[PDB]
Amino acid sequence: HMQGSLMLDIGGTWLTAEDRQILRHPEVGGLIIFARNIEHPAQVRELCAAIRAIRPDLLLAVDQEGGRVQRLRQGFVRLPAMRAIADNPNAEELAEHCGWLMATEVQAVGLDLSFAPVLDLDHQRSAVVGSRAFEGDPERAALLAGAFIRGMHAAGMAATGKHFPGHGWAEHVAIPEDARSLEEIRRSDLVPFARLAGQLDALMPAHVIYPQVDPQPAGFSRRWLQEILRGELKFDGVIFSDDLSMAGAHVVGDAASRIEAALAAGCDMGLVCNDRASAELALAALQRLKVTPPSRLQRMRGKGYANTDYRQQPRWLEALSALRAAQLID
């Protein structure tokens, strides 16, 4: 008897026979979509509606930030990279309009959540963060990200920060490492997570090892999650996990043990993406563990609804005009 949940994905654009069957299990708590699942706004809207007909309580998420990481394209406005938002005097509200406009549009197609914003610091070396972050100096990036979260919450969408405790300095031979003292990490990459700890609804851990703190990745470290995230930072939200079926991950064992290690470390929901066979393995482990969904998991449901006329409300006009006034909307 413990707590935990599973977030998986599908293959095509509509639900297959086994997709409907595997979704009916209560241990499955979420579903995340990628480019292979998206075609049109009216299509992804019906895709969510098809899922709610099966599980009205399921969590539907997607990777929708600004810049190169935007899965919703064919019918959606192209949002600029969050680094481009910083280079403006009115950048605080400019990021606030960006969070509101991103959440309202992805909620208009039936989705609950977007894994945004990135809280990583744009130092020189990490390439996977790059333009996805705001700036390199810490305290300003946390100010701009907090404004981005204000816009998301204004649209009724919960925000999830990525990637705890920091992916900006961690540079396929092994999983990247960040060999810096905890006192040195807290002075740099950790403070954006500290400032926004009480504001964020959820967090995703980085697939990074910090040797002077814990010998494991953050997504499995009881010390990173239970000792300093919940105790020191006083984060009372949802702890997602890294991709437990990550391509090229250096975690020996099957998905059944990867999800058990994450739940024991403090994670509430486990992600298995682009690997169906691993989703059944982790589902089978959660069933034999007899887990129930954590009470925090419902705070992630999007307070918006699938709306065809979301372009009618006034703020959509003011936000759209304010963003292209700074040359951000194409």
Ligand X SMILES: CC(=O)N[C@@H]1[C@@H](O)[C@H](O)[C@@H](CO)O[C@H]1O
- Site residues (vs ligand X, CB under 6 A): 63, 115, 128, 162-163, 167, 243, 273
Sign of the dihedral defined by the CA atoms of residues 132, 136, 139, 140, in that order: negative
Active site residue 178: no
For the CB of residue 128, give the shortest distance to ligand X in the complex, in Å: 5
Q: Enumerate the H helices of 9-90 as residue ranges.
A: 17-23, 41-54, 82-86
CB of 115 to ligand X, least distance (A): 4
Q: Is 97 annotated as a binding residue?
A: no
Strand 2-3 relative to strand 238-239, pairing: unpaired
258 is in an annotated binding site: no
CB of 304 to ligand X, least distance (A): 20
Mode of pairing for the β-strands spanning 209-210 and 214-217: antiparallel
CA neighbor of 197 nearest in space, from 160, 166, 222, 148: 160
172 part of the active site: yes
Which residue lies nearer to ligand X by CB, 242 or 319? 242
Q: Which is nearer to ligand X, 55 or 163 (CB)?
A: 163
Q: Which amino acid is at 173?
A: V
Distance CA 321, CA 190 (A): 34
> Is 275 flagged in the annotation as binding?
no
Hey, what amino acid is at 7?
M
Establish whether 167 is an annotated binding residue: no
Q: How many alpha carbons fall within 13 Å on the CB side of residue 278? A: 20
Residue 173: what are its φ and ψ, rounded to 5°?
A: -70, -40
The reply, when asked if residue 112 is annotated as ligand binding, is no
- Of the candidates 242, 243, 268, 275, the residue annotated as catalytic is 242
Strands 5-8 and 28-33: parallel
State the virtual CA torsion across 228, 233, 236, 239 in degrees, nearest 10.
-50
Q: Which is nearer to ligand X, 112 or 243 (CB)?
A: 243
Smallest separation, CB 127 to ligand X (Å): 11
Tokens in use for 244? 């437990």
Pairing of strands 5-8, 209-210: unpaired
Between 167 and 186, CB nearer to ligand X: 167
Q: Report the nearest approach of ligand X to the CB of residue 282 (Å).
A: 15
**Nearest to ligand X of 104, 241 (CB atom):** 241
Q: Which residues are annotated as a binding site for substrate?
A: 63, 71, 132, 162-163
Catalytic residue numbers, as ranges: 172, 242
